[PDB]
From a paper:
The two best-characterized internalins, InlA and InlB, contribute to L. monocytogenes invasion of epithelial cells and hepatocytes by binding to their cognate host cell surface receptors, E-cadherin and c-Met respectively.
Using pregnant guinea pigs, which have a placental structure that closely resembles humans, we identified a protein (InlP) secreted by the bacterial pathogen Listeria monocytogenes that strongly promotes placental infection. One gene identified in this screen encodes InlP, a member of the internalin family of proteins. While most internalins are predicted to be anchored to the bacterial cell surface via attachment to the peptidoglycan cell wall or to lipoteichoic acids, four of them, including InlP, lack obvious anchoring domains and are predicted to be secreted by the bacterium. Here, we solved the crystal structure of InlP, and identified Afadin, a cytoplasmic protein that localizes to adherens junctions as a binding partner of InlP. In this work, we identify the host cell cytoplasmic protein afadin as a major binding partner for InlP, and demonstrate that the InlP-afadin interaction specifically enhances L. monocytogenes transcytosis—that is, the ability of L. monocytogenes to exit from the basal face of an infected polarized epithelial monolayer, consistent with its potential contribution to placental infection. We demonstrate that InlP decreases the magnitude of traction stresses epithelial cells exert on an underlying extracellular matrix, and furthermore, that InlP facilitates bacterial spread from infected epithelial monolayers into an underlying compartment.
Author numbering: 33 to 388
């Protein structure tokens, strides 16, 4: 497929948009300018920005040998470019980058099981809707970083990667994952970003001995979660904006939580009774100095919100809301703590009470 050189750029790359971008990469003023192999050899990166390039025209890159190119960056692209091709003329490619275009999920991209880029180190496709699944890569043994945030990835599209043993960073934030694999073969993984997914738990990871940062902010973790037994390198576990009533005790010293919500059990009491709750997370946060303010408040929510006297029982680790003056009926109660009026943060727990 290699076009004979020397030749005009437009003859080597017979597509208006591709030729324009190649002239810019080659620092030639015109697509009519004649290039030779030395001009190609001077390139160490290729940038693309003309949105008329399509899958078919990008394939024309196989007509030229790029002996020294290690980076491909696609900064702007149209709807007819949905894949960077697996061509044989960029043998030393190390980084592949697609920009996150303006707007939300406006472009679609597929991720081939690339075979001709054995030196690939980093792939970034964040912000683009993934077409199909992420392949269980077989041709990129040196892959170290994978940025795949905001791509509408579901758990059926994410394999338990078998052949990328050097992976260090995996960013899957802002997707629709309901489960995450108990990753078997990425033991060098140090950073796992899962914020803004739909997770309800994770496995008690069996082989992540080097993981230092695990971000689970804004998921659906509810009540209790797995109490990790084998994350010896863990430094930060972000559980902010979940629905836990208790934090995992084995890793409590790594946790970031300032806001949290939750539901406590229904109770039935008699008119004149107070109402006492368990709230393990409050006591954990209090005792490990995670609170920014000390007050614990209670209220009931009807036509208006009415505050109730609320006391913390530190010996028995319970909280009592004084419901003794309420008449019989059905009530929605709330206990809140860690109020941060400056930031909008709060930890707030709701439950229903029947008073007979
Ligand atoms: Ca000229
Ligand atoms: Ca532009
Ligand atoms: Ca070289
Ligand atoms: Ca975007
Ligand atoms: Ca999908
Ligand atoms: Ca395996
Ligand atoms: Ca106590
Ligand atoms: Ca509430
Ligand atoms: Cl030549």
């Amino acid at each position: 497929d290699l076009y004979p050189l020397p030749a005009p750029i437009i003859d080597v790359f017979p597509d208006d948009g591709l030729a324009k971008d190649m002239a810019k990469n080659l620092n030639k003023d015109s697509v009519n300018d004649v290039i030779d192999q030395d001009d190609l050899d001077a390139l160490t990166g290729l940038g693309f920005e003309t949105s008329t390039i399509t899958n078919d025209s990008m394939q024309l890159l196989e007509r030229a040998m790029f002996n020294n190119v290690t980076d491909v960056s696609i900064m702007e692209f149209g709807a007819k470019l949905t894949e960077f091709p697996d061509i044989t003329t960029i043998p030393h490619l190390k980084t592949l980058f697609f920009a996150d275009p303006p707007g939300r999920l406006t472009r679609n991209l597929s991720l081939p099981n690339y075979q001709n880029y054995p030196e690939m180190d980093t792939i970034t496709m964040s912000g683009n809707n993934l077409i199909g699944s992420i392949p269980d890569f077989t041709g990129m043994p040196a892959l170290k970083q994978l940025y795949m945030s905001e791509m509408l990835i579901t758990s059926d599209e994410l394999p338990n990667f078998n052949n990328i043993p050097l992976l260090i960073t995996l960013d899957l934030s802002s997707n629709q994952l309901t489960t995450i694999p108990d990753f078997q073969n990425i033991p060098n993984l140090t950073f796992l970003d899962l914020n803004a997914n739909l997770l309800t738990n994770t496995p008690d990871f069996q082989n992540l001995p080097k993981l230092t940062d695990l971000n689970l902010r804004h998921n659906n973790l509810t009540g209790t979660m797995v109490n990790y037994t084998n994350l010896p390198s863990l430094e930060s576990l972000n559980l902010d904006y979940n629905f836990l009533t208790e934090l995992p005790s084995n890793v409590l010293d790594t946790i970031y939580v300032q806001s949290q919500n939750g539901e406590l059990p229904d109770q039935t009491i008699n008119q004149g009774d107070t109402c006492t709750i368990d709230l393990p997370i409050y006591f954990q946060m209090e005792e490990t100095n995670m609170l920014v303010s000390p007050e614990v408040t209670g209220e009931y929510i009807g036509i208006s919100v009415i505050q109730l006297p609320t006391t913390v029982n530190e010996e028995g680790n319970t909280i009592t809301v004084d419901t003794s003056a309420l008449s019989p009926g059905e009530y929605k109660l709330d206990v809140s703590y860690n109020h941060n009026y400056a930031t909008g943060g709060v930890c707030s727990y709701d439950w229903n009470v029947t008073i007979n």
